[PDB]
Amino acid sequence: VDMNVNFDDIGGLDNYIDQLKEMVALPLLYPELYQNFNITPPRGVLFHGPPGTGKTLMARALAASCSSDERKITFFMRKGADILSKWVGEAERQLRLLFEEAKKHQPSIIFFDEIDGLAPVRSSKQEQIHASIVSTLLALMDGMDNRGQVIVIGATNRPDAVDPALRRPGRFDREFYFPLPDVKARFKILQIQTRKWSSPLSTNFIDKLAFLTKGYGGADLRSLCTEAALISIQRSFPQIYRSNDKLLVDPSKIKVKVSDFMLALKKIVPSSARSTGSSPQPLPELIKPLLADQLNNLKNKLDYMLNIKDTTFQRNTSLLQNFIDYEEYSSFRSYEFFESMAESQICKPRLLINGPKGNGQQYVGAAILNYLEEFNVQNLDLASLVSESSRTIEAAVVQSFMEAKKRQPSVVFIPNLDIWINTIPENVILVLSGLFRSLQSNEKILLLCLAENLDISEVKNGILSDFAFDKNIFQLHKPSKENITRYFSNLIELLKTKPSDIPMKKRRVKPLPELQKVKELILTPEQIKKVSACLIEHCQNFTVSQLEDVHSSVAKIIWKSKSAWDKTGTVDEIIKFLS
Amino acid sequence: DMNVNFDDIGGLDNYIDQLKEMVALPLLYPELYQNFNITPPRGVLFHGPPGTGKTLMARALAASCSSDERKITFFMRKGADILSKWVGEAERQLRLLFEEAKKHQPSIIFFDEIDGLAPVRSSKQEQIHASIVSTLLALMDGMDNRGQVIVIGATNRPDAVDPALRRPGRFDREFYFPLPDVKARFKILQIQTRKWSSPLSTNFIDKLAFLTKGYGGADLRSLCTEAALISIQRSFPQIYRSNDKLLVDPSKIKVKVSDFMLALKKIVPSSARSTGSSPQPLPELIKPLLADQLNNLKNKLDYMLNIKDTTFQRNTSLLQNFIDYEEYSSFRSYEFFESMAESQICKPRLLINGPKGNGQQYVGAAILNYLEEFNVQNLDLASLVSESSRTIEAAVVQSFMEAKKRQPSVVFIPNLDIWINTIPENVILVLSGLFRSLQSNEKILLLCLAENLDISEVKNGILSDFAFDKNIFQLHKPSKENITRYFSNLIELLKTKPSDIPMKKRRVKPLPELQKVKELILTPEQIKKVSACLIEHCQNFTVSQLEDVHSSVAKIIWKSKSAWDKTGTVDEIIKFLS
Numbered sequence A: 001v002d003m004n005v006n007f008d009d010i011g012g013l014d015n016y017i018d019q020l021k022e023m024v025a026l027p028l029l030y031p032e033l034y035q036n037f038n039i040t041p042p043r044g045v046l047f048h049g050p051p052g053t054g055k056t057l058m059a060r061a062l063a064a065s066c067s068s069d070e071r072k073i074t075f076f077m078r079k080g081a082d083i084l085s086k087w088v089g090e091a092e093r094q095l096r097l098l099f100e101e102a103k104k105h106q107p108s109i110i111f112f113d114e115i116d117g118l119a120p121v122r123s124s125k126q127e128q129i130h131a132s133i134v135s136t137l138l139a140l141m142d143g144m145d146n147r148g149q150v151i152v153i154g155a156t157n158r159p160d161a162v163d164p165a166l167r168r169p170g171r172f173d174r175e176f177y178f179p180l181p182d183v184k185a186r187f188k189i190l191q192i193q194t195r196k197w198s199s200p201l202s203t204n205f206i207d208k209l210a211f212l213t214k215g216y217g218g219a220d221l222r223s224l225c226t227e228a229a230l231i232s233i234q235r236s237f238p239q240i241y242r243s244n245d246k247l248l249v250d251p252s253k254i255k256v257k258v259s260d261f262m263l264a265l266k267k268i269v270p271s272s273a274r275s276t277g278s279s280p281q282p283l284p285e286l287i288k289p290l291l292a293d294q295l296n297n298l299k300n301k302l303d304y305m306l307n308i309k310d311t312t313f314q315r316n317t318s319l320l321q322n323f324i325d326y327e328e329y330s331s332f333r334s335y336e337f338f339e340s341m342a343e344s345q346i347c348k349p350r351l352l353i354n355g356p357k358g359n360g361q362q363y364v365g366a367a368i369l370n371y372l373e374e375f376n377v378q379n380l381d382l383a384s385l386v387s388e389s390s391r392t393i394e395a396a397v398v399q400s401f402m403e404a405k406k407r408q409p410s411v412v413f414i415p416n417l418d419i420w421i422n423t424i425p426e427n428v429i430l431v432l433s434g435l436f437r438s439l440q441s442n443e444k445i446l447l448l449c450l451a452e453n454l455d456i457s458e459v460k461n462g463i464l465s466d467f468a469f470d471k472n473i474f475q476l477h478k479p480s481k482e483n484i485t486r487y488f489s490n491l492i493e494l495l496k497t498k499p500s501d502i503p504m505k506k507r508r509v510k511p512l513p514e515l516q517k518v519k520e521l522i523l524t525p526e527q528i529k530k531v532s533a534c535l536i537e538h539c540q541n542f543t544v545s546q547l548e549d550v551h552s553s554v555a556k557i558i559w560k561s562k563s564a565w566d567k568t569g570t571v572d573e574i575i576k577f578l579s
Numbered sequence B: 001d002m003n004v005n006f007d008d009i010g011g012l013d014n015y016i017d018q019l020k021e022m023v024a025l026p027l028l029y030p031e032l033y034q035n036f037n038i039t040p041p042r043g044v045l046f047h048g049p050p051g052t053g054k055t056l057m058a059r060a061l062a063a064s065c066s067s068d069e070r071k072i073t074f075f076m077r078k079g080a081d082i083l084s085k086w087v088g089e090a091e092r093q094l095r096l097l098f099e100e101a102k103k104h105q106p107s108i109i110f111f112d113e114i115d116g117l118a119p120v121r122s123s124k125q126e127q128i129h130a131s132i133v134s135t136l137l138a139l140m141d142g143m144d145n146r147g148q149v150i151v152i153g154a155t156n157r158p159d160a161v162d163p164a165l166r167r168p169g170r171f172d173r174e175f176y177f178p179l180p181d182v183k184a185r186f187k188i189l190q191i192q193t194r195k196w197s198s199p200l201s202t203n204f205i206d207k208l209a210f211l212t213k214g215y216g217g218a219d220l221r222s223l224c225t226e227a228a229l230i231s232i233q234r235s236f237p238q239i240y241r242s243n244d245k246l247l248v249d250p251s252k253i254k255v256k257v258s259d260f261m262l263a264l265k266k267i268v269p270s271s272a273r274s275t276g277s278s279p280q281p282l283p284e285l286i287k288p289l290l291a292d293q294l295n296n297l298k299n300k301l302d303y304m305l306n307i308k309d310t311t312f313q314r315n316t317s318l319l320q321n322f323i324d325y326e327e328y329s330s331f332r333s334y335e336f337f338e339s340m341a342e343s344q345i346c347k348p349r350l351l352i353n354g355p356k357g358n359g360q361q362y363v364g365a366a367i368l369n370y371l372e373e374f375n376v377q378n379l380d381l382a383s384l385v386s387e388s389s390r391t392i393e394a395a396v397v398q399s400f401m402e403a404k405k406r407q408p409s410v411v412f413i414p415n416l417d418i419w420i421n422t423i424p425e426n427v428i429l430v431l432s433g434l435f436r437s438l439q440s441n442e443k444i445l446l447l448c449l450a451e452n453l454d455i456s457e458v459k460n461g462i463l464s465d466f467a468f469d470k471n472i473f474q475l476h477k478p479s480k481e482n483i484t485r486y487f488s489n490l491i492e493l494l495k496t497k498p499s500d501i502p503m504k505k506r507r508v509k510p511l512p513e514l515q516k517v518k519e520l521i522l523t524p525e526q527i528k529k530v531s532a533c534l535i536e537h538c539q540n541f542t543v544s545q546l547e548d549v550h551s552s553v554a555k556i557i558w559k560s561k562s563a564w565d566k567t568g569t570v571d572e573i574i575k576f577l578s
C-alpha cells in the first residue's frame, strides 16, 4: 500500500487531481508564486464518498506520483483508530511522534484512513478516551509552531462523524466528495483494469460493459474484472482445480470472452444493490415497448424542469481544463446579472407520477433515476427510514433532506407515495414540507414521487397540498395497442425458433487432456396471426403487471415444448389458456 | 511561529490592550500595585468559535514580547501532550515545566485545547486525568506572590474545562473571541490582501466583507488563498501539465473580481460545514419585490432593539474611549442613566405574517443576516427533532438556555403555522413559560414567520401568551411597481445582443508554451406588448407565482440566446401568457 500506483491508474476524478497537484506538487517546484501573494498552500483534504470510490487509491497515487523527481514524499499511513491502547499514555504520545517524524522529513503526507473512528463526535457519555485524542490532534495540526510541509489527508465514508473542529481551514480546509463513477468514468476504469491483459477487449464491448455496470464503483469494476479472469482460467484449464501438484499450463489462449464477463456480472452484486433504496437502472429490454413511449415524455418534461440539455453555466467538470481550452470574455453587469438570470430557470422542481395499480411504476422510477445520472439520489421510502433502528422517522427524514441540500443537484425520491402518506406519521410530512418551503427557488432539489391510484383531491386540498404539485402531475396511462403488439411480437419470435437455435450446452465426446506435472419447423403463419390476435384481445385495458403475468404464463407454455418441431400443440395450448 | 505583530490581528483591540497591560505594566510600573493591596491578574482563558484568532493572539503576544530592551520567553504545551503511560511521569513533566517557568523569571505559559488536558471533574475515571487536573490546580494556584507566570488557555468549549480551574485565583479573565462583523471582516481582508502587488479597490473589499457573513479569520484567509490560487490557474495553466519546472513570471498574475467571485462559491465557512449554509442577504433578482417592505421591517427592528445607536461600547477599544473622549454626581446619576438606557427594551417580539409563498424564507434569512451581533438560536423543526435522543422539550429548553447565555439573541421560529401543529401543546407552553420568566430589559428577540396564520390563533389561541399584540408585521403581495421592475430586469435579457452574452468561446490558437528552465431587431412596440402582458398576467400574484412566471419566460428567452430576429421569442412569450 505504498507505491506502484500513479495518476494514470485513477479514472474519472480528473478535477481533484489538479487541485491535489495544486497543493502538493506545485508548491515544491514553484515557491516564488505562492510567496508572491504571501499565501500558504492549502494543506489537508478530507475525502468522503460511497465505499469503493478510490480514496485510498487517490492518496497512494498522490504519494507516489509527485515523488517521481528527486523530491521524495514520505507516506505515513495510519489505519482508523489503531493508535489508542489500554492505558492513557500512548494514544497521544504516538500521534506526537507521528507528527514530529513528519516534520523531520519535511515533504510528507499523513493519511488517516477511516478517520471517523480516530476522531468521533463528542457524545453524552464516554468522553475521555476520544476527547483526549481529538484535542491533541487539533493541537498538532494547527498549532502555533509551523507544522511544516506536512499534507494531512483524511478519508471517511461520511464526514458528519468527524469532529467539526477538524473540518476547519488549516486542518481540513478542503473536502472532496468522491462520487460513484458515471458511464465515462466506468468506461475508463474498465479500460484501465483490462490494460495489461495479453488479449485486449474491443472498444464496443467495453462500452457495453460500462452501460451494463450502472451503480458499480471502482472496486466493483475491479472485482468484476478479476472474476471474469478467474472464469476464463476455469474455462480454459479446469484440471488445475483438481490436481494438488502444479501442472504445466501456458498463459496463452486464455483470452477472456463475453460469456465470462456475463457470468461475472451475476456473481458480483454492486454496492447499489446492498442499499435499501431503489437502484437506478435502465428499462429492462422486455418492457421497453410498453413503457418507453411514455417515459421519453417524462424525460422531456424533466428536460424542461432541470435544464439538463441546456448546460451553458455551471458546466464545471474541471476548472483547469476550462481555463485551458476556453478563454475569458462591465463587471457586475456581465457576470452577476447573467449568472442570476441563468439560475432563475429552476423555480421549484417537482414531479408526481400517478398511474393505476400495477402500471410499472417501480420501473419508471428506476429509469428516471438512471437518466438523472449526475444527481444525488436520496431515498425517503419507508425501508430506508426504518432500516436504521437507532434513528427515528423524523431524524432520518431531516438527515436525508440536509444531505440533499449539500451537493445541490439532488433528487428526493419517495416511491409508493400512496403507502408513504398512510404509514408515516402526520407530522413528518409537515416537517418535510417545511424543509422544502425553507428552500430558495433556484435550488435544484427535485421532489419526485411515484404513487399508485393517488386521489387528486389529496394533492389539491390535503396534506400534500403544501408541496405544490399543481402542474407537475404526470399520469402514467395504461399501455396502448401497439406496445402490446410489440411485446407479444417478441413473445412470438421466441415461439417460432428452431430447436437448433435454442442454446443447449453440450456433452463432450472426449475427456479433457491431462496436463504434464512439473427436421423442419412446421408453423403456418395463420397460426401465428391467430395467436397474436388472441393475445391482443385477451389483454384489453390491461396494466403492465397483468401483461407481464400473461407474458410469463405464455412463455412457460412456449418453453415447455422448446424441442418439439410440431408447434401445433403449443399453439392450441396457448389458445386454450387465453379463454 | 512567525514574526506576527499585533497589527496582523484585526477586530480584537480590547483584548490586545488587556494583554499588553497584564504583560508589561506588572513589570514596567510595579509601584501602582502597592497602594491597592491587589495582585495582577494571573490567568486568562481564550474561548470562542474555531478560527477566530486565539492561537494568533498567543503568537502575537510571543512575537511582540521579544525585543532588545526586554525578553519574554514563551512555553507551549499542546492539549494532553504531556502525559504518558508511566503513572506519575506526567506530574514530573508538568512540575518541572513550571520550575523552568519559575527559574527563568521571564516566561508565560500557553495551554492549547485545555479542555482535553483538563476535562471536567471526574465522577468516574479516577485515572491520571484527575491527578493532572489536581496537580495543575495545586501548582498554578501559587508559588510566587506577585510573580511573572501568565497561564493562557485556549479552547473552543469553555464549559468543558474543569470549574475548579475557572476562578478569581486561576484563569482570572475569560476572553470571548467573536466571529467578526462587517467592520472587522473589512480589516481582516485588508490585512490579508496587503502585500499583494496589485491591491484591490476598497469598494470591492466592502462588498466582499458584506458577502462573507459567518466567515472567521481562517475562512477569510482561505478565501484569499483560493482567490490567489485561481488567479494562478487562470494566468498560467500549463504548470498543471508538466512534471518539471517551467519558467513563469510574476507581475502578470493579478487577482481580479471574477476569481474572488468564483472562490466564494467553493468555500464554506466553518460555521456552516455541519449546518449546510448560512443566512444570506436578499437575493438580487427578487430585490425589487421584497426590499420595498424589508426596509420597513428593518426600521421596526431598529426601533425595538436599539441597533443603530449602541450607546454602550460603540467605538473600537475601551482604552480608545479613554484616550479620545472625556469622562463627563456619579453615584445616583450613573445608576439612573444606565437604568434609563437599558429601559429602552420592553419585550422584543416580531411575527412576520403574509400569504402563502410570499417570499418569507427570503425575509427571514435577510433579517437574520442583518442582525450581526445576535446569537441566533433556531427553533425550526429541522433543528429540534434532528437528534434521536433528546426530546423536543429538551431541545427547546436547551436552545432557550443558550439564547439566555449570550444576551443579544434571536429565538428564530420559521414556519410558525407548521410549528404550532408539529410541536405539541406542552412544548409551546414550556417555551411560553420560559419567555414570561425573563426580565423586560433582556435582549432576547422572539422572531417568527408564518404564512396564512389566522390572528385568532395569536390573540386568543396558543400563541396569545407570547404577547404578539401590536408587533404583527403584514407582508403583502408586491405592488405593480415592484412587478414592473422585476419584469423589466427580465426583459433586459431579451434586449441583450448574442455577442454581448458571456458565452465562453474556444480559443482559436493553442496556449503559448513556456521555456522549460450586426444589430438585433426589436421594435419597442413588441417590448411594450411583452411588458403589458407580463404585468396583466401577474395580477395580485404572490412572490412564488411571480418567480414561476419569471423562470418560465427566462427559459424561452435563454432558448434564443444566439438569435437576432427576436420576433419569434416575443410571440412565444405572448402565447405562453395566455
Ligand SMILES: Nc1ncnc2c1ncn2[C@@H]1O[C@H](COP(=O)(O)OP(=O)(O)O)[C@@H](O)[C@H]1O
Binding pocket: A009, A010, A011, A012, A013, A050, A051, A052, A053, A054, A055, A056, A057, A058, A181, A189, A192, A217, A218, A219, A220, A222
Ligand atoms: N476512480 C477510480 N479509478 C480507477 N480505479 C479505481 C477508482 N476507484 C476505485 N478504483 C479501484 O478500486 C480499488 C479499491 O479502492 P479503495 O481504495 O478500496 O476505495 P475506498 O477506499 O473508497 O473503498 C483500487 O485498487 C482501484 O483500482
Ligand SMILES: Nc1ncnc2c1ncn2[C@@H]1O[C@H](COP(=O)(O)OP(=O)(O)O)[C@@H](O)[C@H]1O
Binding pocket: A142, A170, B008, B009, B010, B011, B012, B049, B050, B051, B052, B053, B054, B055, B056, B057, B188, B191, B216, B217, B218, B221
Ligand atoms: N483577527 C484576525 N485577523 C487576521 N487574521 C486572522 C484573525 N483571526 C484568525 N486569523 C487567521 O487565522 C489563522 C490562524 O487562526 P487560528 O489562530 O488557528 O484560530 P483559532 O486558533 O481560534 O482556531 C491565521 O492564518 C490568520 O491569518
